[PDB]
Design a binder for this molecule. Structure first.
Ligand code: C5W
Length: 862
């Protein structure tokens, strides 16, 4: 019908690529992915349209619980019924559950409307006012994030009784429309010609090619002869590799590098030896090369789409048989793997136990762990990664006996599985195994590691893969996973190397949720408008005064195309947050280089909670900032699970397009720089500039409120000192540190991390030390209490050291200039002192903390 056509065009504008372009490729791998993933995604949609009303609440509005609650006191709550202005305020216990609260609200309604109610508390859920958030399930009220948030800021929770019939109606409204192993000859290729090559004509062209299984070489690299620099070089050379065709692992990649010599690299191109159908590739192949910025094994195996500019390499994959050759099926693999030999003294078992309880190892150590592989599966299953790295992947017989053990290997913990997703484990069965051990991930853990999982999609060799199906299935089952999966993919559509894979996943997702595609379209339209408004602000700020640019901005925003496009949307930063009425008079732009837009919203239905802001930033790369903020959030989750709340501010930061993204406004907060200006006729005007920040906290927090504000400052200070030390956040100054009116300190503008290469020391600023000490010169009772907070925070993070290392290792796929090699992850190994005992790492940390105090005292002596 006309609808199928309309949806296809809406998908096209949403993903930023015409769907006709996918068909124009005439690519069988692309075509098969589209068919298969459309089928799988529409199955999910059908499953969803029949969920029960509580199950549909778990899809659309997943519970936001406190980290402590995963796996008393008096409380005032305001409850109202859907479509009623009359509300009931009643005292409840933080230990009470939503059903008791609901049954209580029903009894009030029954007395108020003088009628015993047929409705039972079991037929309801409590919505947070003007938000896509709900309180339901068997959990005390204090376990919910919203109730927890209300208790700390003193404020009263405002809840609406929503009946099942209204929830079911939402579900209804949102429905989709109605053999190789005998081939002993050495692997070889033919390097035919080069096309569109650009280099210095004094030099000569060389083609270096190597066979890789992930990062490791399957044999030594081979180099073609030197041929004089020109546009179309003609080699005609049969390059031979020291590896039998029978020994090529399934995931073997042929990597090429084209360079000029008198060392000047021109381009690179990679390709999988076996196709997506496991057939050994033969024939002629034109490799549209990528411009180099050594060989590039981790780089994409798909050719450069820019066929006009790109230099091309013509190669010939020889026909090794008169019939097609496929990689042997698992049944053939396991049949060969079933046969081997298992058997050395207790002293040699202790040698194996010492190495497996540790990490690089010698060649004699490799020989021991390989022969003892059966004992590895039997007594140390979590050491699979060590055994997988000692497996000789260039020996088809060794690969077979490894796979035999892996196929009966027990499911490993989530920490172990995340390590197996790294590019240093390129086997498909290994990747299928890791995905299997990751199905046990809770939606909360999945959401926490979604950014890393999206990045390891760039390591994939084929379109249809276990990770894609896993991410699609989880996104289709949880709307928040879906929302964030879509944005992570959409923000990378300008990267030609991922635009095809990422575009195809988003299309598949869209087939899974027509309604959500429309909701995301509403977000893309606002972001389109924001870009146009920001471009304008940029040029105006360069010509006239700030009040003049601000007034022109407001007039442009007051156009109906802008009022419609910027209003009534779900926030890309948090689909729970609804951005209702754009507050034009409160909108402005900041004075920094990119003139970022400061956009405010209000919602009568949400009250004070509806007053939310977004920062539109265009011109900067926000990926590193988002990663740093997600890591600080992880620390906060890890500190909270051990009962330590350091009052952190991990505000939203989401890239949405090319050098484009949104940042969450933290209201009632100013930078340390703005507070320290010490302006005249203010409630905080100081006698000593050292008093300015404490005077400001006093003006915001009168009487008893001050002690709480200083404690919030101390807690947040300790968390950020540890966060910035562990992560190597340098270039810290008064204009990238902010303070909230509650006393909470937080950092912004995370341009540089991991010491990028200098060792970032522990930092203690005197201005903050002065606040922690309550404005007293000596207050060791409060100072040492802060030092205990730092040590406790540091100690907790170390216990989770391997979780940070694994996540940051997966993030290497993002290609962030500050996260691109082994030395970057070494910085975290050093900061977290993982090569030490807790006692030794605590002395190490104390020696670093005492050194920061002596630094801070250069300002105390002044
Ligand atoms: C890029 O621009 C960027 C921005 C943030 C980020 C900054 C701020 C922030 N910076 C200064 C101020 C304080 N100021 C108070 C007064 N109001 C006006 C409207 C009266 C303007 C702001 O705020 C910020 C505040 N809340 N969230 C924020 C984020 C972080 N990272 C950036 O680039 C990576």
């Amino acid at each position: 019908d006309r609808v199928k056509k309309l949806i296809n065009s809406q998908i096209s504008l949403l993903i930023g690529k015409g769907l006709h372009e996918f068909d124009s490729l005439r690519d069988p791998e692309v075509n098969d992915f589209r068919t298969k993933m459309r089928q799988f995604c529409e199955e999910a949609a059908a499953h969803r349209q029949q969920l029960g009303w509580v199950e549909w609440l778990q899809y659309s509005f997943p519970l936001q619980l406190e980290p402590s609650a995963r796996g008393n006191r008096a409380l005032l709550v305001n409850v109202k019924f859907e479509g009623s202005e009359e509300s009931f305020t009643f005292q409840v216990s933080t230990k009470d559950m939503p059903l008791a609260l609901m049954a209580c609200a029903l009894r009030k309604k029954a007395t108020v409307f003088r009628q015993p109610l047929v409705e039972q508390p079991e037929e309801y859920a409590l919505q947070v006012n003007g938000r896509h958030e709900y309180l339901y399930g068997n959990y005390p009220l204090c376990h919910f994030q919203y109730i927890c948030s209300c208790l700390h800021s003193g404020l009263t929770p405002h809840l609406t009784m929503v009946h099942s019939s209204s929830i079911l109606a939402m579900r209804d409204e949102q429905s989709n429309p109605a053999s190789l192993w005998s081939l002993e000859q050495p692997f070889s290729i033919e390097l035919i010609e080069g096309r569109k090559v650009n280099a210095d004509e004094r030099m000569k062209l060389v083609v270096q090619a190597g066979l890789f299984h992930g990062n490791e070489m399957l044999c030594k690299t081979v180099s073609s002869s030197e041929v004089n620099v020109c546009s179309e070089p003609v080699w005609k050379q049969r390059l031979e590799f020291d590896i039998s065709v029978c020994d090529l692992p399934r995931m073997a990649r042929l990597c090429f590098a084209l360079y000029a010599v008198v060392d000047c690299p021109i381009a690179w191109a990679n390709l999988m030896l076996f196709d997506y159908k496991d057939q050994l590739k033969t024939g002629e192949r034109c490799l549209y090369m990528w411009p180099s910025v050594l060989l590039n094994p981790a780089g994409t195996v798909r050719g450069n789409p820019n066929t006009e500019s790109a230099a091309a390499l013509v190669i010939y994959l020889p026909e090794v048989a008169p019939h097609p050759v496929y990689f042997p099926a698992l049944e053939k693999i396991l049949e060969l793997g079933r046969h081997g030999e298992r058997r050395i003294t207790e002293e040699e078992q202790l040698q194996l136990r010492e190495i497996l309880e540790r990490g690089e190892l010698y060649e004699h150590e490799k020989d021991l762990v390989w022969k003892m592989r059966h004992e590895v599966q039997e007594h140390f299953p979590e050491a699979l990664a060590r055994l997988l790295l000692v497996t000789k992947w260039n020996k088809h017989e060794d690969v077979a006996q490894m796979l035999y053990l892996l196929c009966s290997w027990p499911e490993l913990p989530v920490l172990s599985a995340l390590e197996l997703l790294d590019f240093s484990f390129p086997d498909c069965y290994v990747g299928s195994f890791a995905i299997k051990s990751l199905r046990k991930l809770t939606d909360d853990e999945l959401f926490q590691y979604l950014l890393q999982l999206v990045q390891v999609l760039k390591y994939e060799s084929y379109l249809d893969c276990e990770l894609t199906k896993f991410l699609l299935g989880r996104a289709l089952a949880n709307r928040k996973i879906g929302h964030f999966l879509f944005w992570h993919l959409r923000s990378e559509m300008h990267v030609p190397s991922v635009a095809l894979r990422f575009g195809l996943i988003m299309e598949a997702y869209c087939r899974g949720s027509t309604h959500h595609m429309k909701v995301l379209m509403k977000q893309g339209e606002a972001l389109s408008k924001l870009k146009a408004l920001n471009d304008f602000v940029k040029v105006s700020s360069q010509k006239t005064t700030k009040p003049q640019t601000k007034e022109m901005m407001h007039m442009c925003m007051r156009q109906e195309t802008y009022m419609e496009a910027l209003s009534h949307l779900q926030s890309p930063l948090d689909p729970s947050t609804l951005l209702e009425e754009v507050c034009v008079e409160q909108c402005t732009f900041m004075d920094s280089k990119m003139k970022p837009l400061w956009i405010m919203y209000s919602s009568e239905e949400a009250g004070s909670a509806g007053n939310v802001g977004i920062i539109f930033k265009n011109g900067d790369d926000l990926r590193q900032d988002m990663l740093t903020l997600q890591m600080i959030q992880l620390m906060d989750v890890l500190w909270k699970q051990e009962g330590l709340d350091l009052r952190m501010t991990p505000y939203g930061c989401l890239p949405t397009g090319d050098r484009t993204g949104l940042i969450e406004v933290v209201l009632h907060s100013d930078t340390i720089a703005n507070i320290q200006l010490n302006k005249s006729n203010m409630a905080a005007t100081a006698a000593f500039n050292k008093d300015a920040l404490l005077n400001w906290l006093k003006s915001k927090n009168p009487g008893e409120a001050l002690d709480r504000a200083i404690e919030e400052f101390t807690l947040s200070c300790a968390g950020y000192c540890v966060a910035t030390y562990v992560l190597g956040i340098g270039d810290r100054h008064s204009d990238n540190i902010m303070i909230r009116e509650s006393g909470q300190l937080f950092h912004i503008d995370f341009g540089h991390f991991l010491g990028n290469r200098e060792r970032v020391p522990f930092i203690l600023t005197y201005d903050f030390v002065h606040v922690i000490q309550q404005g007293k010169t000596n207050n060791s009772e409060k100072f040492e209490r802060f030092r205990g907070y730092c040590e406790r925070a540091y100690t907790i993070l170390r216990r989770h050291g391997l979780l940070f290392l694994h996540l940051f290792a997966l993030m290497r796929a993002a290609g962030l200039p500050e996260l691109s090699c082994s030395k970057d992850i070494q910085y975290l190994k050093d900061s977290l002192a993982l090569g030490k005992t807790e006692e030794e790492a605590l002395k190490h940390f104390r020696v670093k903390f005492n050194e920061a105090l002596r630094e801070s005292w250069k300002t105390k002596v002044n």
